[PDB]
Structure formats: structure tokens, C-alpha cells
Amino acid sequence: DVQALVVDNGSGNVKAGVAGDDAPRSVFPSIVGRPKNPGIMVGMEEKDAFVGDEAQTKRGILTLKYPIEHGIVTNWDDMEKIWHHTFYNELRAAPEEHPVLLTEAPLNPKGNRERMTQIMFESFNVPAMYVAIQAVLSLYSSGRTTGIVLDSGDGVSHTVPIYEGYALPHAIMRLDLAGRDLTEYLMKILHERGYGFSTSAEKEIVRDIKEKLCYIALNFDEEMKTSEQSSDIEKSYELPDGNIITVGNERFRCPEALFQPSFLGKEAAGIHTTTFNSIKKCDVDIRKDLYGNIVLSGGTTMYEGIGERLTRDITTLAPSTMKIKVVAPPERKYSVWIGGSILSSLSTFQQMWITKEEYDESGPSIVHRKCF
Amino acid sequence: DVQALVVDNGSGNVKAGVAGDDAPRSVFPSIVGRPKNPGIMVGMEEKDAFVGDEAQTKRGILTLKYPIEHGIVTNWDDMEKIWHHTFYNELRAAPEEHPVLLTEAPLNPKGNRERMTQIMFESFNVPAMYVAIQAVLSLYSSGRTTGIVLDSGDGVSHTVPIYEGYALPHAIMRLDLAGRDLTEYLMKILHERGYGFSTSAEKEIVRDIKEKLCYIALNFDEEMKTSEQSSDIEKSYELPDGNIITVGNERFRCPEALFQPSFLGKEAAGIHTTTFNSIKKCDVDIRKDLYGNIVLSGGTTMYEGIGERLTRDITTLAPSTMKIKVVAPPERKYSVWIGGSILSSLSTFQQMWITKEEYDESGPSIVHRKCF
Amino acid sequence: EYLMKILHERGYGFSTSAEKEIVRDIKEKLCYIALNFDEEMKTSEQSSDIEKSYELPDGNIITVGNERFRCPEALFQPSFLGKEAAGIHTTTFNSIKKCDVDIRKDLYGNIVLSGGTTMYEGIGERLTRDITTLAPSTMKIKVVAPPERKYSVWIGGSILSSLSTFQQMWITKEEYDESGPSIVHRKCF
Amino acid sequence: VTNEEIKTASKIVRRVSNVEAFDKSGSVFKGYQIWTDISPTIENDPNIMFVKCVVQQGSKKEKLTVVQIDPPGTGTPYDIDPTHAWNCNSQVDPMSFGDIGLLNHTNIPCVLDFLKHRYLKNQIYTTAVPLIVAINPYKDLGNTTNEWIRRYRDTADHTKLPPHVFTCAREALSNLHGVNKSQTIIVSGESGAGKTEATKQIMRYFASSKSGNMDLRIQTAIMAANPVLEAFGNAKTIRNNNSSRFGRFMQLVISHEGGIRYGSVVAFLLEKSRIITQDDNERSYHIFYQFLKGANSTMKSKFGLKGVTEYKLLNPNSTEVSGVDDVKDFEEVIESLKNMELSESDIEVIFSIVAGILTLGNVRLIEKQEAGLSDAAAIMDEDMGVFNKACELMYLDPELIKREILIKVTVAGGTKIEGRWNKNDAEVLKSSLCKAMYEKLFLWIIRHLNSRIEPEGGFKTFMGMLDIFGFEVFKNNSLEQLFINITNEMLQKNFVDIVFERESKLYKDEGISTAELKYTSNKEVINVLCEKGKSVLSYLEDQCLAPGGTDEKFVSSCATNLKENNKFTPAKVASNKNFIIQHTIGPIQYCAESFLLKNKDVLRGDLVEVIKDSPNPIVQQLFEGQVIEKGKIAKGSLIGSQFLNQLTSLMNLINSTEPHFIRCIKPNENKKPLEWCEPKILIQLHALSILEALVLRQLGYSYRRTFEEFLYQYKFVDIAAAEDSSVENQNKCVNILKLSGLSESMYKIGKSMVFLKQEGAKILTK
């Protein structure tokens, strides 16, 4: 028997593996770098595009670009490069022997998955293919059939409610505000201390600062007030070349823009209001079982103290007799991939692939019939 | 198979040899002398221009001139004389049978290498030619692909950083302060003891004094202070005709003008600041690998105690957690030539020569396309 | 600094701090902006009417060619001087595209140049032609380059400070004495 | 057997000629036999790859319904595809001739079954002119009797005799004594396919003349060294236990009508990289293990030896092999050394040298921050004693060896400058010293043996017996296999040239035009592999010289530059470490891992001079004759350049003489006689380029027959011009041809024979 390949490619990292395991085999960032200087020594690799983890060790020489933004692919040649590197160099398994389970976000344009299908069936020659939705696999991986999933990664933040296996497509909500916007907002508000990060290879240093030092405050105004009385809020960080920088308020002002998008000039609602407005579009009978299973997912939900803030902020909006219960598993950064592997390793699922004959006789539009 | 000829001609000496060896065959000064007195005995050589090592044994009769100053050729007839003497009398190998690898300094005018090419292809008839840069060959000869080269010879002092084979042309720095200025400064400050050297043939005696007796002090002010308490600083030197001179402070005040050019009336920065200002023009990610490979080269870097002073002076400018590492090989006087031979004896390089057909169809400007 | 660097290719070496002023004066006197960079670089190798002469303080004569339109071109292609950034024509368009779709038509109509580095000959035409290529086809790009745009900031400051509504926005001395130097973060935008 | 051989053999199989027997315009069959690969016995017997099926009368054109008969596994008809059906040979007998290029249908199962049939009746020799195939029967066929030698020598007719090694022997003796031209026998096969037996039989045939004897002191002297040779020049691989890692050559000078006057032994292409590092599942040369285990107490106390698992040059995870005892062979090699006139002092010296090699292989080097360098080399204090020992057992001066390993002296225009090596270069120099000492000791032993049977008039016209190996067609390939494949490409070029010349001569003798015989050449792959400037080896050297070179850069530079021609191709999976070369026998894949570490070898003139001034005479004789050259960079001393030089010398030596070819094959692995394993035999048919020779015959007219056999075979096709009994054979044959309907582009009528294309004979059958 042959196993399937599970490839969950978001706007940031790429998670890839074989169906059956309980963790992705290869995780690497989805960037393509190109050299901006001329090479002068003879006998060196005259490569013209570095992909993945190699374009990250020598980022000081290259210009880095992401081919996916807001969940939508803006450059298809770079995406083909990423997929080629993923199949042949990372997994080391030709795609012409295994079926592939890809992943997309809800409320995306249709040309996206149509072109994805055309590329999978024409450039590579896969025997079968399928395109799932991330917030559903994140629930597969949890042992539940009822709950609302709040998935937040690098490009998109979306909520999807599900009641006993039935999808409620009129209550799906999408919000273009994720980790990349928080990186840019931190890079902007760091100017107030005299630190200027501008290049594309300095965005990675800011991202690492954000991952290491930022947290979420339970009460924003009280926290902003008690930080002007002392200096135990400040932390230090050492740059790659040896300098030392110090951060204060910026530790809890950067992620706060998830709950108040107007900080970064957007007219939208926070993740605590988008979640409550998505429950209130469901029938009055099923609202008590959604308040009990609020599942966090993605990587941007990994700040310290986000469950407490989310619970306290939804409890204030819901009636007084409900029991709010936020579920934050410790490995929620790979929930989509684990759910995809579980799903693709089922016997009932083996009748839902999009085989090659159907594509040959019906064209790329077939994905709109067979895939939800 | 035929080997190439490697000719590294600086402002002082000339290093020449055949590609494949590990040391230059012929090393001789690049001077042209002319007699200033009339010859009176019959049956003697009525030569009118002595070149190289011959113009140095009978310098008491001649007026000596250098055809290269600050890396730029100021007299082309004397340069043709030097090249003729190098090919036919020193190497004893006609240039019409071998390719020639010449060498130039960075940030020079373009007419220089254009005229060099025209002369090589028209006066002599070489089958192929190439023009390299000295600070790159000095790194070829070291077994590294990452580092900053501080090359200091007789006319020019320049720094060139390189990261994994990629050149960073916006961080190249040039400084017109080298051994000849130190010779003139010593010749000037020797007047304070009553020794007057004025003629062109007495500049060589001063140069020899400098090579024999001068050194670099670790701390200039402490050294200047502890030399007024005793007389163990003084040394003696015997002139060609038998007199004895004595030198004191001048032993460590002459090379100190490399770190404080204002001693000799120049408005510039020392070699320890020019090196640090050249690292600080590189991206923050690649600065830690340049602090670890600072390669000394050329002949003016051969003073006693220059590595310690350079390390102590750069450590004071860099952050506290970096590891400064100055590399001073014991044969750093011929690093450019060894690197040139290594380079010209590669199989990948044999496609980069400037053949004669390209020159015949494109003119002397071709060097600006094929040579970096 | 970029002009001082690329002048080495003709054999002129300016190094000291008092020779930077001579280079600055050369730049102010002889440089201009080309409408199409590649066509200009190509048509300058066919003749020598591009070259100009300049007399140094002590009497020497230097001649400049391509360097007349290659120095300011680094405003539109910063990679010439080793920077990873976008030109002034892309930074301007990327700043309009961060505004709401309703107010973008009134920004395309009033692009105001200011400062002294915007005084090269032919910068309005290049900027208009380069933004027109990025904007939709039905918009009306309109670059405004007043002839005294070198002192616009000062004139605006005088106009502002000579208003009656403004006299309530100064940071008086009592507020500083009672609140410290941080007061500027409240009262000044 | 394992499954990897099954996969490889299944991947070798081809498919070309289509099936038939729907003649003429219906669906009638004549009891037609085919070969197929789908059968219940195939998925059960691993030693079977094809079965002979009979198509049932009434099958359809689209799908074939067949019942197998060979072996008779069942009788129930089943269905197979027309693409899994290869033709067969039913109107032919494998014992009516020896040549194979005469069969009508030549493909994989046809030739396999042909060889199987001939072999099962103890007929092990076969001919593929001018090739001679042989098989190892694991017993004695009674062909070593002097009766056979006299039968094949004295009988003036030999060309109408069964094929035998004595055919080649007699042709060689004839061409040697007739015209003054030297001859060469090339025995190319696996190290277990019985090559030594063929060599011994050829030498015995050579020994017996009309005045010659049976045994000669040369024979017993040469066989008095095979223990030594196989102890020093053989190692345990993963697909063998006694693999020969060098080419053995023997020059024999024989009188006109006497025996064997003198002989000399020469070794070529010894693999030096094995002395330093071996794979995880192999060992080094035998002598190390057998000397370390079999040495008596006095040596283990005098030399200071330790256990096998305590040395750096020896792979610790694989030291034991079951079929080898590793003890008694030590006494065997000692006795073989005693038999060749060596005192006890010489044995003591040789084993001290080997122990010193093993000891020096254990010294460790560290880095220092001194001499203005960051990584100046230095010997670790803990081994400072060990090092001294390693210099005593070789009779060398420790201080001078330290000076030549850790110090670098550069002579400028007129001055001496004293540098210092880093750690990597110092380790390279130490390893080079070890490998050079080993190889020179081996060569000195060979010379001391040759000293007894030396000819004094020199070799002007002699006899040659080269013992070589074949391709390496598995999936885990490295630098050594690359060298082997290069050697075999050279040999293939030589073979094709010889064959084309002989066939042009033959066509010229039988009165046929020769403006139509065109053979393909393998000069493109040789240019891709070994040209100067643009080849794999040149770029490997470049990466060994350039600063900061790696294997990935080597693969990338090859992929970028050799992209002009289609003989180089990068892999698909992990394409930054593997590549593929299109050899003449098909594509082989290499893994460019640890190429640089195994290609670096630097020996300088100063060290040679230090060695030549040793007090011991044997060490003085070790490096003598070798000229030195100091003041250069290592651009001609790396392993690739040495290999190319030795290959050039050997190919010159061969191109001097006239060659003859012999191929040995082993039928199975359990050594039991009269067996068969079609995968393991198809692999060796592929490696030895036998199928390539067959494909080469099928150009031109491969079916060459005299009029007698031609009429005997085609007496039933044409009756109107066969039994006339009134005209010459050429006339009746040309009448049969003009009646058959073959165009001139399909036949030729020779002055004593008839020549037919492959398509011609495929037509004339029906």
C-alpha cells in the first residue's frame, strides 16, 4: 500500500510529511531569495535562486520574497520553486507515486485552487489530489465534532463553527490581520527608541524579537499605567553582530493590535469580537455548545497569556450563565497538519480523491464539485 | 600544454614568475636610472637607461625614478622599459607564447587598464590577457571565502570585504598612504639629529634604515614617556662609507603615522579606523564573520608588533562580545602573487581570458566588460 | 558621496572634508535628470555634446560626461549606491495605496514637491511619467513644483505661527516647569 | 538471493521486436511459442525470470491466451498482454554450433535459455566472435588432460572444433610464431567466476610444446606468490569476500619451439584510497587483519600491537568475515615469503613497516593560535610518544618527519621563509605518507619476486595475460567505481576498434564492398569523463585546489559546464549530491559524497629526500628511481592524475600488442555445480558488455554461413532450385535468393559463404 503526502503551506512556514505520522517531517520557511551582489571568486555555486532554509543562513546577501500573501498566491513561478524543493529535496519522494492533500483558507478566490489543481496535475503528475480547509483539520486533530475554531497564522485569521459534523457556511468569518502585520507594527513602533530596521533581511530579526519578548496583557490600561512606575518591564536582546537593545512597553503593545486593530490603521473588530459575532449568527439552540469549545490554532495564538485575555473578554460579551471554555493545546502550531494526516489515513476518505481521469475529462473546474 | 605568466607590479618591487610555482621567480625594484655625469673611458657600455637591479648597484652615478605612483602609471615609456626587461631579461620567455595575468588596485581610473591592455596586445603580442585585483588574490592564497583584506604596499592601502565569494563593492575603501610616505616622513624627521638625506640615491639608505630598525609600539604615549628615562631605545646603523648614526624615538614614530596620518599633514583616518568603517558598511548579519578573518597583506604590514596593535585598536571599537582575529601569515609579502598563480592554474578560469579576437573586434574597452 | 565616488573613473580624487564642498557645487551646477535612462545612456556614446567643463578654485579644468545624469538617477534606483530600498517614485505610489479607495483620486491630483534635492532639471516630467505608469489609466497625475520650493517649509511655518487660532498651542514655561520635558509628546503631533 | 538483484535484473530488461504468427491474413497458429514474464511459478521461484508459453489456437490479436510449458506449472490458459511477450527460437538447436550471433531472434530470454541449455549438459564454453564466454562449473570437466592439448594443437583444423580457451591459446601461439607480433589475453570477470583456472590452463597449454615439458619453475614460482598477492592486493567488499583491487599483468617470453623461458609480473591501478577509510560494511586489505591476528607473542611485544578494534585506519564495526579464518592465512603468507628467498630479517623489516603504518595512523593533530595564524597545526602531547614509535618501526628520523609534516618552507626570489601548515593540510600530508609507504612496499615485493625470473635480453616480442574486472552497475557508487567504469570505457573503445578492423578485413577477403560498415564510437563519454579542462576529473581537481571547496560545488559546476552534451545529467531526488552518466551499457548513478576527502593526496620532494636517507637498505630501496620536483603546487599529484597516468601507460602497453578476449561467469553463489540463477547471471551479462557485443554484431551482415549449411537450413523453403544437382552452390543460392523476394539491401553472396542481415534471416524463416 502507498501513503499520501500531506503538504500544509501557509503564508509563512511550510509543513510537509507523509500521512500516518504524528508530526510534520520537514518544516521550513517559504521564501525565495536572490543575490544582489556580483560573485567574484571562481569555483563557487553560481545559483540564481535560494529556497527555504538555505536562503535563511545567507540572508545577508539576498533579497527575500514571499510568494503567498494573505493566503493568496501572488507569484506562481516562485510557488513552483517552493513545491519542487519540497517534494524532491525535503521529502525526497517523487509525487508521481503518492496522492497529495493540499490545504487552503476559506473565502478565497476560485482561480487560486483551480490553478493549484492545474499545476499539480500538469507540472507534476500526481495520481490524485484533494484540497481541504485548515479550520476543519484543526478540529479533526482535537477529538471533537462540535466547536468553533479560531485559526490565526501569518496571513489570515478566520473563525469556523461546526455542530456535530455539519458546517454552517453563513457564519464563517475572515480577517486579514495576522502575524506579518504585527511584525510590521513592531518594526514601526521600534523607531521611538532609535532603532531602524528597514531591509528585508532585518525583518527576520524583528520577527525573532517578537517571538522571544512579546506577551499579552490581561488589562491593557492598568498594564500601561503600572509600567511607568518602574523599570522591571524592560528586557535586553543581542543582535547578530553584538549590539544590545532594550524594549519596554513594546512588549505588550505589539500583540494588543489583535484586540484593537485601529492601532495599525484598520477599521475592523478584534479577534474577541469576530469570535462572538460568529457565534451570534448561529441558531439559538446550538450556541451553548460553541461557548464550551473554543479551539485556538495557528502560530499567532502562541503568545503568553492569550487564553486568559480571550476568556475574560468573551465572558463580558456572553450572558451571565454560560460557561466559556477556551482550549489551547500546547502543540497548536501543527494542529492543521496532524488533522490532515488523521483525515488522509481513513478508509472512508479513499473515495473522495480527485483522480486523474476526472481531471482529464472535466478540466480544472472539477475542484468546485468534489471539494467543499 | 602552456603555462601562464603572472606579473604583479606594484609601486615598489616587481614580482614575476610562471603560473604553477609557489613563489615568484624574479623580484626586483621598479626603477629607471639615468646617468648624470659624462663617461670618459673608452671601451665601456654607453647605455643610457639602467633598469631594475642594475640601476641599484650603481645608484651613486644615476638619477632614479619610479614610473608608478599611488598605483597609477605616470610615465608609459619607462613602464614599457620595465616590462621589456621583465619579459626578455628576467623571465627569459617571449610573451607571444603565454597568456599574461596582470594586477591592479581598486578604484583606479579606467584609462590605466585600457592603456595597459592596448600595450599588451599591440607592443607585445600576447595570445590572451587578464587584469585582476590584488586584495582578491590575497584571499585566494589563504584558503578562505569570507574575510576582509587589508592590503598595504608602497603606493596604496585598501580594504576589501568578501562574504562567501560575493563582493561588496560599496564597502571598498582606499587610502593614499603607504610605505613611500613613511620613508619621506622618516627622511624628514631625521633632520632633528643632524642627518640630511636629500638625493634620490639617499632615499634608498633611508628605506633600508626603516626596514631594519623601525617597529610599532603597543601604546604610543606610554612608549614616548618611558623612552625619556633611559637610553636602551637607541640603535646604531653604519652607512655605506663607514659613518655611524644613532636613532631613538624615530624607531616608533615613523610607522605610527599609519594610525595617525595627521602626523604627516593628511586629513584622513588610520588603518584601524578605515578597517572598522568598512565593516560597518556591510549588513548586520555578515559582520560577525568579518571580525573573525582580518587578513594582512603587502609589505608595509611587516612591522614588528602590528597584529597586536591592530587587534587592541579594533577591539576597542567593536562590541564587547565579538572575537577579533587578525591573521598575519609569515610570507604575507608575496600573497598576491601566490594567489594569482593559484587562480591562473584552474580549469574553470580558462574561459575568462581576453583573447585576441575579442580585442581585434571590440577595441581596448573590452576590459570593462570581462574584468571586474 | 556617490558622485565623489564615481568621479574616480576619470582620474579625479576628492577625499578631504573641504573637497566635499567642491563636489557638492559641481553637483548643483552640472547634474540633471534624464527622462529615459537607458536611451540617454545609449545616445551619449555616439557624440561628445554631453560633456561639460568646470574650473576648480585654483585654476584647473575638469570635464564630466555620463556622471551628469548618473548621479541623481540613484534617487530612482537606490541599488546604484548599495541600498535595498525603493525609489522616490515607488515610495510615493506605495503611500497612496495605503489610503482608502475613496481619497486616492484627490492625492493623484496634488503631488507637491519640496526641499532642495527636488530642484534638478527635469524631475517633474520623470516623476509624472513614472507614476502614470503605475496608476490606473483614467487618473490625472499632476505634480506641482513651485519655483521657490527650497524654502516652502519656512514660509509655511511663518504663515502658521502668524495665526490667531495658533496662539493657544504653544508650550508655555509653566507647563514645562510642572510636567517636565515629556510634555512635547502630548501637545505636539 | 536478495530483492535488490531482482530489481536490478528487472530494470535491465528491454523490449523491441513484436510478436507474430498471425500469418498470413488470418489468426492461425503453428503451435507458436513465446517468452513471457507473468506466471505463478515466477512469483514463487526467485531463480526464474521468464517462462516459455504456447499460445492457444483461437486467441485474439488484442490479448493473448497462452498455456506455459517450460516449466509445466499448469495447464489452465490465462491472458497476458502483447507487450510482455518476447519471441523464441524453436527451429534451432543450441548444440549444432557455438556462435550466438547466428540465432534468428536475439534478446534477453533467448540468450539466457541458450546458455542454460548448453551449460546443463556440461558444455560451458560459447563463442560470440571474437568473444569467448566461459562459465565456472565448480568441478572438473576433464579438459586438463594432455590429450586435449595435443588434439587442439596438432590437428591442422581447429576452427571447426568446439570453443575452448585453447582456441585463443592456439590462435595466439600461431600469430606469435608466424609473424613477429606480440599477443595479449584479457581475462575479464568477477573475482569468483574462475579466472585463475583459465590462466593456469592457458599457461599449461603454453608450457607443453613438441619439445616442451608440462610444469615449469616459472609456474611454481608465480603460484608461490598468490598468497602474498591476495593478502596485499585483495579486500572484502559487500558483494564478495576476496575481491581483487588491482590489475595483474604477466609478460612471458617463450622460445620458438620450447617452453616458457622467462616471465615478469606487473601491477596496475592499485586503489590507494582504501588504505585510509573504508565503507561501513567492508574492510581494508587482508594483510592488516591477518598479520594483526596471526602474529606470535614476540612480535606483539616487540612491535607493540593491540587489538583489531583499537586502530583508526581499520573500520571497527566490520572486522570479522565467516568464510575467512584470518589466522592460518598468516602462516600461509609467511611461508610464501620464505619460498621466494627472503631471510628472516627481511620479514621482520616488512612487518615492522606495516606496524609502523598502523601506528602512525593513530596520531592525532590539534589546532593552535600561534605564528600569527588562527589554526596552526600541532601534535597532541598525549601521542608524542606514539609518534616516536611510528618513526622507529619505519627506520626514519622522528625530528625530520615532524619538520616535514608541521613546517612549510617557501623560497622567495632569494630568501627562505619558514611558514606553518594548518590542521587539514597536515593531516593530508600524514595520510599521503602512509599510503605512499604502503604502495611502495608492495611494489618492492613485486620487484624482489620478479628478480628471480628476469629476462636479460629485455622484452621485444612477448606474451601477455591481463587480469581485469568489469563495470559496477549497482546504485551505491563512489569514486572507486567511477575509476573502474572509466577503465572499462577505455577497454570498450579498444575492443570496438579491434572488432571493426577484423570485420573490415573479413568483408574484404570474401569480395564484398566495405563502404557500408559503420560502427558507433564512445568518444563523447570519454571526453565528458577524462578530457583536460572540460571533464568530471578536471572539475574535481579544481574543487580540490580552490578555496573552500565542497562536493556540492563540484556537482553544481559539473551541471553548469557539462550541460552542452547529453552524457552528463543531474539526478531528480537530492539533485545537489547525485548525478548520472550515460555510459555505453546504460545510465549509472553516482553519489558525490566524500569525493574531496578521497581525492586529496600530496607528497613533496623534501619528504622523499628525507626517506631516501634512511640507514636501513630496504627503506633506501623503497622510493629509489622516483624523481622529485619541489617548488610547485599540487596540480598533478592528486589521485585523479596518478590514475590517468597509469591508465595511459596500460593502454599504451595494450595498444602495442594484439588482444584476445575472454569472459568468465559464475552461475550461482552457493558453489553447488549445475545450478542457475537468471537474475545473478543477467547482471553479469550486462556488466561484461556481452549484450553490447551482440548489438554490435547486428550491424552489417550478422548471419554468415557457407553454402552447405545455408542449403541445409533452407532446403524446405525453395524446392525449385535446391535439388537440381547440376549447378554450383553459388548459383543455386542466388536463385533461391532471387526467388525468396529479398532486395539487394538485405543479402550478400560471398565467394565462399553467404551473408544475411538480421531482418533477412527473420524474413526467410517464414
Ligand SMILES: C/C1=C\[C@H](C)C[C@H](C)OC(=O)C[C@H](c2ccc(O)cc2)NC(=O)[C@@H](Cc2c(Br)[nH]c3ccccc23)N(C)C(=O)[C@H](C)NC(=O)[C@@H](C)C1
Ligand atoms: C538598531 C541597530 C543598531 C543600533 C545602532 C544599536 C544601538 C545600541 O542603538 C543605538 O545606538 C541607538 C541610536 C539612537 C538612540 C537614541 C537616539 O535619541 C538617537 C539615536 N540609534 C541610531 O543611531 C540609529 C540612527 C537612525 C538612522 Br541612521 N535612521 C533612523 C531611523 C529611525 C530612528 C533612528 C535612526 N541607527 C544608526 C540605526 O537605527 C541603524 C540604521 N540601525 C541598524 O543598523 C540596525 C540594523 C541595528
Ligand SMILES: C/C1=C\[C@H](C)C[C@H](C)OC(=O)C[C@H](c2ccc(O)cc2)NC(=O)[C@@H](Cc2c(Br)[nH]c3ccccc23)N(C)C(=O)[C@H](C)NC(=O)[C@@H](C)C1
Ligand atoms: C648623515 C650623513 C653623514 C653624517 C655627517 C654622519 C655623521 C656621524 O653625523 C654628523 O656628523 C652629525 C652632524 C651634526 C650633528 C649635530 C649637530 O648639532 C650638527 C651637525 N651633521 C652634519 O654635519 C650635517 C650638516 C647638515 C647639512 Br651640510 N645640511 C643639513 C640639513 C639638516 C641637518 C643637518 C645638515 N651634514 C654634513 C649632513 O647632514 C650631510 C649632508 N649628510 C650626508 O652626507 C649623509 C648622506 C650622510
Ligand SMILES: C/C1=C\[C@H](C)C[C@H](C)OC(=O)C[C@H](c2ccc(O)cc2)NC(=O)[C@@H](Cc2c(Br)[nH]c3ccccc23)N(C)C(=O)[C@H](C)NC(=O)[C@@H](C)C1
Ligand atoms: C582632481 C583635482 C586635480 C586634477 C589633478 C586636475 C587635473 C586636470 O586632472 C588630471 O590631471 C587627471 C589625472 C589623471 C587622469 C587620467 C589618468 O588616467 C590618470 C591621472 N589625475 C591625477 O593625476 C590624480 C592621481 C590620483 C591620485 Br594622487 N589619487 C587618485 C585616486 C583616484 C584617481 C586618481 C588619483 N590626482 C593627482 C588627483 O586626483 C589629485 C589628488 N586631485 C586633487 O588634488 C583634487 C583636489 C583636484
Ligand SMILES: Nc1ncnc2c1ncn2[C@@H]1O[C@H](COP(=O)(O)OP(=O)(O)O)[C@@H](O)[C@H]1O
Ligand atoms: N512563540 C511565538 N510567539 C508569537 N508568535 C509566534 C511564535 N511562534 C511563531 N509565531 C508567529 O507565527 C507565524 C507563523 O505561524 P504558522 O501558522 O506556523 O505559519 P502559517 O501562518 O504559514 O501557517 C509567524 O508569523 C510568527 O510571527
Ligand SMILES: Nc1ncnc2c1ncn2[C@@H]1O[C@H](COP(=O)(O)OP(=O)(O)O)[C@@H](O)[C@H]1O
Ligand atoms: N621588513 C619590513 N619592514 C617594514 N617595511 C618593509 C619591510 N619590507 C618591506 N617593506 C616596505 O614594503 C614596501 C614595498 O612592499 P611590496 O608590497 O613588496 O611592494 P608593492 O607595494 O609594490 O607591492 C617598501 O616601501 C618597503 O618600505
Ligand SMILES: [Mg+2]
Ligand atoms: Mg496555517
Ligand SMILES: [Mg+2]
Ligand atoms: Mg602589492
